[PDB]
Design a protein around this ligand. Structure first.
Ligand SMILES: O=P(O)(O)C(O)(Cc1cccnc1)P(=O)(O)O
Ligand SMILES: [Mg+2]
Ligand SMILES: [Mg+2]
Ligand SMILES: [Mg+2]
Length: 340
């Protein structure tokens, strides 16, 4: 039962959930990784990790991925959530120096992860392990694209740090541009490719239908997170949220901003259904009769299939995950799973 303010009947009726068969092993293996990389305290791992549903989120998204690819993605995605938590905590505690140093180390570790596998900062060491593993699946040109994209994500996190320190709420257009980076749209899009076992040529992944289907899938995920994470984020003095920019710059009430965010999320779905037809037509066209063609066709089709799976995985994740259950916290400003 999804709250009426958050319910999307089109997702429930037309985007049936999928789950990767490796998910049972994935859940425990990522929990063990969080424990052994010291990315969460042992008692917080035991009490909260499974309930945060991070592995479920990936296992409902990258269908068809090799077990080892899914494992590295899930470890990275759990790392990403812990990094969001650390970033938030550095902000709340005014640890500008610790954040700046961390920011620099992630930039460096991103380009040479193997050199950082045993760094003193467990968050940097965890990052490097997952990234080194992700760099092992596809050619160096894919690794360099992942790094280029994540360098941009790190700097968007830095911009968020400056905004919240200075109490600046981005304008709507400014936020929509920033949100494609803080949510890491293009990282999740990159990671479709090791999941289907094929680095896509630029001509293929920059095709207008592939690009637009990829964009809309991520816009939905980020803006649906905004809709669902708004209570926790208002309680935690987070300023980055489409609803908050609407209240601040467009003078909407809370109920009207929630309504406008809802409508924008709903439009993402029906825009995606239109372009999905074009992206799958393009997949069919790539099967020109040659071996390379059949391979590229299959990879594009699998990737567009997972762009669709992202809709249902993110939807149900926000109603299942303990990450957003702010009403159950004694201190609504400090989630119990964060290192405070
Ligand atoms: O769970 P959260 O904090 O609402 C979030 O989605 C965490 C997150 C960050 C980046 C990518 N995916 C999830 P955020 O982006 O900070 O709003
Ligand atoms: Mg956050
Ligand atoms: Mg964030
Ligand atoms: Mg959020």
């Amino acid at each position: 039962a999804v709250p009426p303010s958050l319910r999307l009947p089109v997702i429930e009726a037309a985007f049936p959930r999928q789950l990767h068969p490796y998910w049972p092993k994935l859940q425990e293996t990522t929990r063990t990784w969080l424990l052994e990389k010291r990315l969460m305290p042992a008692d917080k791992v035991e009490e909260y990790a499974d309930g945060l549903c991070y592995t479920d989120l990936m296992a409902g998204y990258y269908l068809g991925a090799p077990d080892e690819v899914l494992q590295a993605i899930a470890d990275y995605s759990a790392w990403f959530m812990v990094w969001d938590d650390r970033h938030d905590r550095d902000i709340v505690h005014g640890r500008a120096g610790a954040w700046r140093r961390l920011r620099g180390l992630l930039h460096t570790a991103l380009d040479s992860p193997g050199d950082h596998l045993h760094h003193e900062d467990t968050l940097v060491a965890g990052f490097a392990d997952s990234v080194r593993r992700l760099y092992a699946f596809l050619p160096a040109t894919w690794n360099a694209r992942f790094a280029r994209h994540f360098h941009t994500v790190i700097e968007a996190y830095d911009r968020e740090f400056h905004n919240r320190t200075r109490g600046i709420v981005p304008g709507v257009e400014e936020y929509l541009e920033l949100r494609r980076l803080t949510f890491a749209h293009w990282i999740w899009t990159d990671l479709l490719e090791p999941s289907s076992g094929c680095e896509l040529p630029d001509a293929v992944r920059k095709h207008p239908a592939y690009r637009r289907a990829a964009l809309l899938s991520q816009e939905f995920a980020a803006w649906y997170n905004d809709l669902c994470s708004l209570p926790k984020e208002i309680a935690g003095d987070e300023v980055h949220n489409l609803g908050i920019s609407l209240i601040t710059h467009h003078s909407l009430t809370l109920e009207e901003a929630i309504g406008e965010v809802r409508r924008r999320v709903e439009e993402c779905i029906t825009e995606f259904l239109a372009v999905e037809r074009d992206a799958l037509r393009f997949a069919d066209e790539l099967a020109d009769g040659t071996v390379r063609g059949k391979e590229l066709s299959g990879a594009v089709r699998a990737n567009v299939g997972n762009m669709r799976n992202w809709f249902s995985s993110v939807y149900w994740f926000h109603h299942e995950s303990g990450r957003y259950m702010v009403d159950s916290w004694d201190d609504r400003s400090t989630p119990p799973y964060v290192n405070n």
